[PDB]
Amino acid sequence: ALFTGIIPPVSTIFTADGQLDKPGTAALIDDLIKAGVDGLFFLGSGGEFSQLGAEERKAIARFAIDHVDRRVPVLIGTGGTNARETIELSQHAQQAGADGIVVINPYYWKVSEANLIRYFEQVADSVTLPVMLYNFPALTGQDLTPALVKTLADSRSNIIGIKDTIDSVAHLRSMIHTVKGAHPHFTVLCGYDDHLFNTLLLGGDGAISASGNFAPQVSVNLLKAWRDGDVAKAAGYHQTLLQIPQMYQLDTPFVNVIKEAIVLCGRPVSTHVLPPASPLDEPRKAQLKTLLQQLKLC
Amino acid sequence: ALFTGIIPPVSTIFTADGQLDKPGTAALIDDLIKAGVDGLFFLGSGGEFSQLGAEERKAIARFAIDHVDRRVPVLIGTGGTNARETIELSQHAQQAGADGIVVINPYYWKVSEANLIRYFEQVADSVTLPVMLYNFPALTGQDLTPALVKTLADSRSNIIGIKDTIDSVAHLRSMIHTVKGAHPHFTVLCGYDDHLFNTLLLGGDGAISASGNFAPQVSVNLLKAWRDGDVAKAAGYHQTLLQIPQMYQLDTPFVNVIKEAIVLCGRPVSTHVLPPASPLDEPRKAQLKTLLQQLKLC
Amino acid sequence: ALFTGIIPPVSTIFTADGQLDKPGTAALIDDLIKAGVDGLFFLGSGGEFSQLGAEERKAIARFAIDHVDRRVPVLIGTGGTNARETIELSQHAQQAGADGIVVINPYYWKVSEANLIRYFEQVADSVTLPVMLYNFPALTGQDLTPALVKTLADSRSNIIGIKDTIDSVAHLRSMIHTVKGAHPHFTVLCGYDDHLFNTLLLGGDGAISASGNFAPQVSVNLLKAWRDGDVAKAAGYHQTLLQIPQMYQLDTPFVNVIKEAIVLCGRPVSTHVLPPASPLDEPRKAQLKTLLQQLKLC
Amino acid sequence: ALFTGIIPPVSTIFTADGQLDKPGTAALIDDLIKAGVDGLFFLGSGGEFSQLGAEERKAIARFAIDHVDRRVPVLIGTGGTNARETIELSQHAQQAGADGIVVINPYYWKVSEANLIRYFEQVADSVTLPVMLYNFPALTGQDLTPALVKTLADSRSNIIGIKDTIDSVAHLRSMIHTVKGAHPHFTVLCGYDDHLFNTLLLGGDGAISASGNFAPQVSVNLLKAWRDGDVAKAAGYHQTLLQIPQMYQLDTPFVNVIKEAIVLCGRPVSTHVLPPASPLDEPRKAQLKTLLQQLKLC
Ligand SMILES: O=C[C@@H](O)CO
Ligand SMILES: O=C[C@@H](O)CO
Ligand SMILES: O=C[C@@H](O)CO
Ligand SMILES: O=C[C@@H](O)CO
Ligand SMILES: [Mg+2]
Ligand SMILES: [Mg+2]
Ligand SMILES: [Mg+2]
Ligand SMILES: [Mg+2]
C-alpha cells in the first residue's frame, strides 16, 4: 500500500507581497520531516491550489520536490476544473520528480458519471505515477462514492488511494469495505483530524489533515502507538485530535488559521494568504491561541 | 445529569396480526435490564412511533412502564407533527409513571425558529417530567443546532438533554461545548452506535442507539471500561460498534433489521413491523446473520 | 382526465379551542364554489392535516363532503406516516362520499423505493376511488420523481394524477412529458400559484394552490381565459399569481397567512391555526393587507 | 439600466486541438447580432470559462470584443477561484474594450460572507467598468441571496446587475423586489430560457440563456412582442422556451448539446468541447434533432 500513515497537506508559505516564501516553506517542510511524517502533500486545499495559477503551481511543486530531496514521499495536488491543465500539471509533477499526484473531481460542473470516469482515466493515463483520488463533497458538490472509487481502481492500476474528506464514519467505513475489500492494498486516508483513529480502527491507512502542519507529533504518535499495539496511548492522542477541528470554524477559508497555528506552535513564517482568503483578525488569533494552549500544543 | 449511559431505543414487538406482543416485548425488556442498561426508551424511531396511532402509543407506553416497574429509568417518545397530540401523549406518559419524555422537532413543516422554540417550551410546560430533545436531521429536514438547544436549556429547566442522531463528530462536539459549557449537567447522548466512544471522549454522556436491542453488552461494557479508566478496553468495544451500522443499510426503514437481529442474537420474538416498513427478505436476513457472526455477536 | 382545473387546498376553519368551525368552513366552501372552482381538496398541507388527529380528520372530511353535496368534485387528503391510518382514512373517505383521495409519501422515514411503491400500491388497492399522488419534497425530504410517478401510474390504473408542489419548471415539465407521455389522461396539477400558467402551457392540467382560498377568481379566470384561447388575458392573471407568493414568507407555517388573507379579502372566518403554527402578529397582518391592496385583491 | 434584454452566453468555438476557432466563433457572433440580440456575453458557463486557462481566456475575450466591434454591448466572464486572476482578467477585459464584466462567486471554498463581500468589492474596485454578478448555486454550492446582492449593490455603484441562474420563480421574484426595490436600475437577467417570460412579468430585465446561441429569434421576438404590448404573442414564444430545456438533459456538461444545436439550426461550426466535457454521441444527436424539429427550430 502506498502513501500510508501521516501525510500533511502542507501549507504554502507566501511573503507579505504574495510571492512563494522559499525560506519559510522550506523550514516548514523540514519541521514536518523531523517530526516523523510518512510523506508530504503539496497543493492540497490547505496549500491553496485553488487560489494559484498553473505556472505558480508548477514553480511551487518544483521547489517543494527539490527541497524535500527524496527524504519522504511527495504528493502534488494537480486538480481543478480545467482538465487539460490537470494533465499538464500532473505530467509536470512527474517530470519534476514527484512520487504521486492527488486529483480532485472537477468542482464547477458536476460532470456525468461517464465523463467523471473518463476524466480520471485520462488523468491516470497521462502519468506513470501513482494517483490518489481526492473526495471533498462539501466543496465539490459531487461525492466520490465507494462504488465509483472501486470502479476507478478496477479500471486503472495506478489509481491506488483516496483522501476522503468528509465528517462521516459511514463514508470512511464503506470506502474501506468496498474498495479495500476488492483491492486490499488501496490506500484510504481520512481528510479530517478527528477521523484518524476511527480510520485506523476501521482498517484504513492514515490521514492527510491540516493539524499535520502545526501539531504533527499528535498524529505521528497516535499512528506509532497504534502500530505498537498501545491502544490506550493512541486513544489519548485521539482525544486531542477530536478537539482540534474547532479551530477551523474561525474562518472560511481557514488556510489563515492553519498558518497562524504554525506560528503559535513555534515556527515563525509569514501567514500571508491568497485572496479570497484574508488575514485572521487579532481577536480570532487570540482564540486560536487559547485553543492550542488548552490542548497543550503551544 | 439525568438519563446518562446506555439507553436503548427499544423495539416494539408486534404479533403476526399487528397487535402489541406483550410476552415478546416484555422478554426483550427483561433481557436489556439483565444486560445492565442505564434506562429504556420506548417509542423512538426504532420503536415505530411514527407508524402507530396515538391510542396505540398510549397503550404501549403504559404496558412498557408497568412492565419495567421502576427497575431502570423509562423514557417515552411522545413527538410527532400534531402538537396537541404531543402534549396529550406527554401528559399521559407522566400520568402513567414514565421518568421522562423524548421529543423530536415537528418533521413535516420545518417551522420558524420562533414557532419551534414556542413548541418545545409548551411541551416542556405541559409536564413536570424531564424532557429530552431528539435531533434527527436526516429525517426531520431541520437541525436542532447547538445554539438553539442552548436557548431551550436556558428557557426551561426541565429541558435536560438531547439524543443527537447524526453521523457528525463536529455536531456532537459542538453540542457538547455549546450546551454543556452553559449547562454542565445537560445530557448529550449520540443516536448512532459508532459515535458512543467519541461522544464519551468529547465529554458527552452516552448513547441511545439501535444495537442496544440485540447487542447491549457491547455498549454497556464500553461504558463500564470507560468509567473504570480502561480506555484500551473501551476502544476494543468501539471497534465493534464502528462496524455494526453497516446492517442498517439493509433496508429503509431498518426497524425490520433490528428485530431480525434480536432473533439472531438469541431472543425469539415476532419480527412483524408496521407498514410502510416491510419484512426483511431471506437473502438480507442471511447477510445480517453473516455480519453478526463476523463481529462475534451471535 | 379527472380532477383538472382549479382545485383549492381549502383551509380548515377552527374555533379558538381548535375544533372545526362549521359555519365558517361552510361559508368558505360556498364562496369557492360560487367563484367557479373545479373541485375542492380538504386536508391538504394548507388544510392542516398534519396537525390533526385521525378522528378529527374523519369528522372534517365527513362535514366537508356533506356540505359540498356533490356540487363539485371533492378530494380528501388521507396521508401521513402511519400507513394503516392512511388506509383507514382513505376507506373512510370513500364511505363518506369523497370523489378521490390525495396521498403524500411518508415524510418521517424516507422509505426505500421498493417500500414506497408497495405503500402507494397498497393504498390504491384499499379503495375503488381515484388516487392523486402528492409531491412536496421541501417538506417530505423525498422527491416523487417523474420516473417513479410513471412507474406508479403503470402499476395501478386508479393512480391518476399528482399535485406537484415544487418551485421548479423542470420538474413540472418532466412530470408532464414522462408521465402524461405514457398516460395522456394522467392529471398534473402544480401546487404553487406562480406555476399555474406554465403548467397549462406545458400541457398540464391546473393547480391546487393556497391563493385558491382568498383569490380563487384569479386562477379561475386565468383558466377560463386559457381555455377560451385568450392567452393575453391569461397572462394578465398570471402576473398577479406571480406576485402572490411573497405573502407566504410572512411566517412558517403560513397557514395563518392564508386565513388572514381570506378575512382581508372579505370573508370573516376565524383565523385560529393549530400548533405548532401560531397567530400572525399585527405588524405582519398590516403588511399582508398592503400586499393584497397593491395586487387589487381587497 | 445596463445590459438589459437578450444577451446570449455565446458558445466558444474550438478546433479539434482545443484552440479558438476564429472563423466559426465570428460567424456565430454575426448570426446573433443579425438576429437582433441586445448584447453578447463571452466566457460564461456555456462559453467554457472553467475549462480554459487564463491566457486562453484573454485571447478569446480580445478576439470576441474585436470582432463585435462595438455593434452591441459586450460582457466578459472573468471569474473563478483565483481572485488575483479574477482581477487580472477583469482589468484585461477593460483594456481590451469590453463594456462590462460578469463575476461569479468563488466555487471551490464557499467563503464566509465577510470574505465574499470583500471579494466582490475588490473586483469591482479593480475596474471602472460595470460589474454584473453571476449566481449559479447548482454549480457553486453557494447562493447569492437577494439580501447579499442588495448589500453588494448598496456598497458599490458599479455593481449593477445579476445573471440569476436558478430554476426558481421565488428566487427571481425576491431578487427583483429586494434589489430593484432598492436600486430601480439594477439589472436582473435570468439564466434559464424557461424563466424569461416570468422574469419580464415580474419586473426584471431579460435573459442570458443558452438557447440564445441556436434560437436567438425566439427570445428576441418574445422580448419585442412584450415591449410592443403583444402579450399573447410573447406567450407564444414562451411556450417554445418552456420546452427547449429538455435538450440540456442529454448530457452533463451540456455545452456539447448547445453546439450541436447551433449546427442543426443551420450554422456549421465545429462542435469540439473541452474536457471534461465530451462529444455528444450519435443517438443523442438524433434525439436533439427530433426535439428541434418538433419545436420548429430547424
Ligand atoms: O483535509 C482537510 C483539512 O481541512 C482537515 O484536516
Ligand atoms: O435510534 C436511532 C437510530 O438511528 C438507530 O441508532
Ligand atoms: O399547495 C401548496 C401550498 O404551499 C400553497 O400553494
Ligand atoms: O445560463 C445558463 C444556461 O445553460 C441556461 O440557459
Ligand atoms: Mg487541507
Ligand atoms: Mg432507533
Ligand atoms: Mg396549501
Ligand atoms: Mg450557458
| Joined grid coordinates for residue A101 | 499526484
CB-count burial class (<10 Å; 0-12, 13-18, 19+) for C5: buried
> Does residue C116 have its Cβ closer than 6 Å to ligand 3?
no
Tell me how far apart the alpha carbons of residues D119 and A104 are, in angstroms, rounded to a whole number. Answer: 24
Annotated catalytic residue, options C50, C119, C150, C163: C163
Method: X-ray
Tell me how far apart the alpha carbons of residues A280 and A272 are, in angstroms, rounded to a whole number. Answer: 10
**H or E element at residue D118:** helix D113-125
Its sign, for the CA torsion A76, A79, A84, A85, is negative
Angle between helices C83-95 and C113-125 (to 10 degrees): 20
Q: Where are the alpha helices (DSSP H) in chain C?
A: 22-34, 54-68, 83-95, 113-125, 137-140, 146-155, 169-175, 181-182, 196-201, 216-227, 231-243, 255-264, 282-294
How many A from CA of D46 to the centre of ligand 8?
4
Question: Which neighbouring-strand residues pair with B132?
Answer: B102, B161
Q: For residue C279, give every residue at least 6 positions away whose Cβ sits within 8 Å of its Cβ, in sequence order, or none.
A: C256, C271, C272, C273
Measured between beta carbons, which residues in chain A are less than 8 angstroms from residue D82?
50-53, 274
Q: Which residue has the cell 457538547?
A: B176
Amino acid identity, position B167: D
Q: For residue D13, give every residue at least 6 positions away whose Cβ sits within 8 Å of its Cβ, in sequence order, or none.
A: D20, D21, D24, D25, D28, D259, D269, D270, D272
Q: Which residue has the cell 458558445?
A: D11
Three-point CA angle C78, C82, C83, nearest 5°:
70
Measured between beta carbons, which residues in chain C are less than 8 angstroms from residue D238?
201
B45 is catalytic: yes
CA distances from D144 to C121, D111, D120, D162 (A): 42, 12, 11, 10
Closest C-alpha residue for ligand 2 atom 6: B209
Annotated catalytic residue, options A11, A119, A126, A163: A163
Q: Which of B82, B109, B141 sits opposite C252 (nearest CB)?
A: B109
**H or E element at residue A5:** strand A5-6
Tell me how far apart the alpha carbons of residues C39 and B93 are, in angstroms, rounded to a whole number. Answer: 42
Amino acid identity, position B193: D
Angle between helices D83-95 and D54-68 (to 10 degrees): 20
CA distances from D286 to C148, D193, D277, D291, D293 (A): 26, 22, 19, 9, 10
Q: For residue D125, give every residue at least 6 positions away whose Cβ sits within 8 Å of its Cβ, in sequence order, or none.
A: D156
Whether the CB-CB separation of A146 and A174 falls below 8 Å is answered with: yes
Tell me how far apart the alpha carbons of residues D95 and A150 are, in angstroms, rounded to a whole number. Answer: 49
Tell me how far apart the alpha carbons of residues C132 and B101 are, in angstroms, rounded to a whole number. Answer: 37
Which of C20, C43, C51 to probe by mutation at the B interface, max B CB count within 10 Å?
A: C51
CB burial string C45-84: b at 16+ within 10 A, e below: bbbbbbbbbbebbbebbbbbbebbeeebbbbbbbbbbbbb
Whether the CB-CB separation of D122 and D92 falls below 8 Å is answered with: no
User: φ, ψ for residue C17 (rounded to 5)?
Assistant: -85, 5
| Joined grid coordinates for residue D238 | 414562451
D242 touches chain C (CB under 8 A): yes
- Minimal C-alpha gap between B248 and chain A (Å): 11
- Length of chain A equals 298
Resolution rounded to one decimal, in angstroms: 2.0
Measured between beta carbons, which residues in chain C are less than 8 angstroms from residue B109?
45, 50, 139, 252-253, 276-277
Nearest atom within ligand 2 for CA of residue B208: 1
In this structure, the strands spanning C159-164 and C187-190 are parallel
* Residue D253: cis peptide before it, omega within 30 degrees of 0: yes
How many A from CA of D138 to the centre of ligand 5?
24
Q: SS3 sequence, D238-292?
A: HHHHHHHHHHHHHCCCCHHHHHHHHHHCCCCCCCCCCCCCCCCCHHHHHHHHHHH
How many A from CA of D53 to the centre of ligand 1?
27
Whether the CB-CB separation of D207 and D191 falls below 8 Å is answered with: yes
Q: For residue C1, give every residue at least 6 positions away whose Cβ sits within 8 Å of its Cβ, in sequence order, or none.
A: C161, C185, C186, C187, C205
CA distances from A149 to A145, A157, B243, D276 (A): 6, 12, 20, 18
Q: For residue C123, give every residue at least 6 positions away whose Cβ sits within 8 Å of its Cβ, in sequence order, or none.
A: C78, C83, C86, C87, C90, C101, C103, C131
User: φ, ψ for residue B34 (rounded to 5)?
Assistant: -60, -30
**Do C276 and B115 count as a contact with CB atoms less than 8 A apart?**
yes
How many A from CA of C212 to the centre of ligand 7?
9
3-class SS of residue C45: coil
D36 touches chain A (CB under 8 A): no
**Do D194 and C242 count as a contact with CB atoms less than 8 A apart?**
no
CA distances from B198 to A165, B131, C47 (A): 18, 24, 44
Tell me how far apart the alpha carbons of residues B9 and D236 are, in angstroms, rounded to a whole number. Answer: 59
Q: For residue D163, give every residue at least 6 positions away whose Cβ sits within 8 Å of its Cβ, in sequence order, or none.
A: D41, D44, D102, D132, D133, D134, D135, D136, D189, D190, D191, D208
- Length of chain D equals 298
Backbone angle region of C141, left / alpha / beta, with phi > 0 → left and psi within -120 to 50 → alpha: left
Single out the residue of C119, C122, C146, C163 nearest to residue C3, CA to CA. Answer: C163
Measured between beta carbons, which residues in chain C are less than 8 angstroms from residue D239?
201
3-class SS of residue C114: helix
Whether the CB-CB separation of C237 and C214 falls below 8 Å is answered with: no
Tell me how far apart the alpha carbons of residues D260 and D258 are, in angstroms, rounded to a whole number. Answer: 5
CB burial string C27-39: b at 16+ within 10 A, e below: bbbebbbebbbbb
Three-point CA angle C137, C143, C148, nearest 5°:
150
B134 is catalytic: yes
C192 is catalytic: no
Tell me how far apart the alpha carbons of residues B229 and C13 are, in angstroms, rounded to a whole number. Answer: 61
**Do A168 and B173 count as a contact with CB atoms less than 8 A apart?**
no
| Joined grid coordinates for residue C16 | 379558538
Q: Which residue has the cell 511551487?
A: A60
3-class SS of residue C133: strand
Q: SS3 sequence, C137-190?
A: HHHHCCCCCHHHHHHHHHHCCCEEEEEECCCCHHHHHHHHHHHHHHCCCCEEEE
Single out the residue of D2, D74, D72, D1 nearest to residue D37, CA to CA. Answer: D72
Amino acid identity, position B24: G
Q: Which residue has the cell 438524433?
A: D286
B185 touches chain C (CB under 8 A): no
Cβ-based contacts under 8 A for chains C and D: 68
DSSP conformational letter for D50: G
CB burial string A185-217: b at 16+ within 10 A, e below: ebbbbbbbbbbbbbbbbbbbbbbbbbbbbbbbb
DSSP conformational letter for A247: G
Gap between the terminal Cα atoms of chain D: 34
Closest C-alpha residue for ligand 2 atom 5: B210
B138 touches chain A (CB under 8 A): no
How many A from CA of C118 to the centre of ligand 7?
26
Three-point CA angle A292, D111, A260, nearest 5°:
25
**Do D235 and C236 count as a contact with CB atoms less than 8 A apart?**
no
- Rg of chain B over Cα atoms, rounded to whole angstroms, equals 18
Nearest atom within ligand 1 for CA of residue A212: 6
In this structure, the strands spanning A187-190 and A206-207 are parallel
How many A from CA of D48 to the centre of ligand 8?
9
In this structure, the strands spanning D131-135 and A131-135 are unpaired
> How many CB atoms within 10 Å of residue D283?
9
**H or E element at residue D90:** helix D83-95
Whether the CB-CB separation of A261 and A277 falls below 8 Å is answered with: no
Whether the CB-CB separation of C96 and B236 falls below 8 Å is answered with: no
Q: For residue D117, give every residue at least 6 positions away whose Cβ sits within 8 Å of its Cβ, in sequence order, or none.
A: D148, D151, D152, D155
List, as one string, the DSSP characters of B5-69.
Answer: EE--BPPPPB-TTSSB-HHHHHHHHHHHHHTT-S-EEESSTTTTGGGS-HHHHHHHHHHHHHHHT
CB burial string C190-223: b at 16+ within 10 A, e below: bbbbbbbbbbbbbbbbbbbbbbbbbbbbbbbbbb
Tell me how far apart the alpha carbons of residues C64 and C39 are, in angstroms, rounded to a whole number. Answer: 12
Gap between the terminal Cα atoms of chain C: 34
> Does residue A213 have its Cβ closer than 6 Å to ligand 1?
no
CA distances from B181 to A289, B175, B184, B186 (A): 19, 9, 6, 9
Tell me how far apart the alpha carbons of residues D138 and D145 are, in angstroms, rounded to a whole number. Answer: 13
| Joined grid coordinates for residue A154 | 478496477
In this structure, the strands spanning C5-6 and C206-207 are parallel
Single out the residue of C194, C191, C192, C183 nearest to residue C158, CA to CA. Answer: C183
Cβ-based contacts under 8 A for chains B and C: 109
D119 touches chain A (CB under 8 A): yes
Tell me how far apart the alpha carbons of residues A99 and A3 are, in angstroms, rounded to a whole number. Answer: 9
In this structure, the strands spanning D187-190 and D159-164 are parallel
Q: Where are the alpha helices (DSSP H) in D126-252?
A: 137-140, 146-155, 169-175, 181-182, 196-201, 216-227, 231-243
Single out the residue of C72, C69, C8, C44 nearest to residue C267, CA to CA. Answer: C8
Amino acid identity, position D108: Y
Whether the CB-CB separation of B218 and B35 falls below 8 Å is answered with: no
CB-count burial class (<10 Å; 0-12, 13-18, 19+) for D172: buried
3-class SS of residue A143: coil
3-class SS of residue D193: helix
- Length of chain C equals 298
Tell me how far apart the alpha carbons of residues A221 and B226 are, in angstroms, rounded to a whole number. Answer: 22
CA distances from A24 to A12, A70, D244 (A): 9, 19, 55
In this structure, the strands spanning A131-135 and A159-164 are parallel
Three-point CA angle C70, C74, C75, nearest 5°:
165
Angle between helices B282-294 and B255-264 (to 10 degrees): 60
In this structure, the strands spanning C206-207 and C187-190 are parallel
Whether the CB-CB separation of D76 and D102 falls below 8 Å is answered with: yes
Measured between beta carbons, which residues in chain D are less than 8 angstroms from residue C232?
230-232, 235
Measured between beta carbons, which residues in chain B are less than 8 angstroms from residue C81?
50-51
Backbone angle region of D141, left / alpha / beta, with phi > 0 → left and psi within -120 to 50 → alpha: left
Could you give the domains of chain B? 1-298 (3.20.20.70)
